[PDB]
Amino acid sequence: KWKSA
DNA sequence: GCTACG
DNA sequence: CGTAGC
C-alpha cells in the first residue's frame, strides 16, 4: 500500500 | 516516468 | 494505482 509517514 | 503525496 | 503537474 504505496508509502506514508 | 520523475516528482509528491498517500 | 491514480491523480496532479510537468
Tell me what you see in this structure.
With 5 residues, this protein is mostly loops. 0% of the residues lie in helices and 0% in strands. The protein contains no helices and no strands. It binds a DNA duplex (6 and 6 nucleotides) through loops.
The gross shape turns out to be elongated
Going by helix content, strand content and strand pairing, the class is: little secondary structure
Distance between the termini: 12 Å
Rg, please? Answer: 5 Å
Sheet with the most strands, sense and barrel status: none
Proportion of strand residues = under 5%
Per DSSP, the total helix count is 0
Q: What percentage of residues falls in helices of 4 or more residues? A: under 10%
Number of strands: 0
Q: Which helices and strands appear, and what pairs or packs with what?
A:
Blueprint: no helix or strand
The chain binds a DNA duplex (6 and 6 nucleotides) through loops.
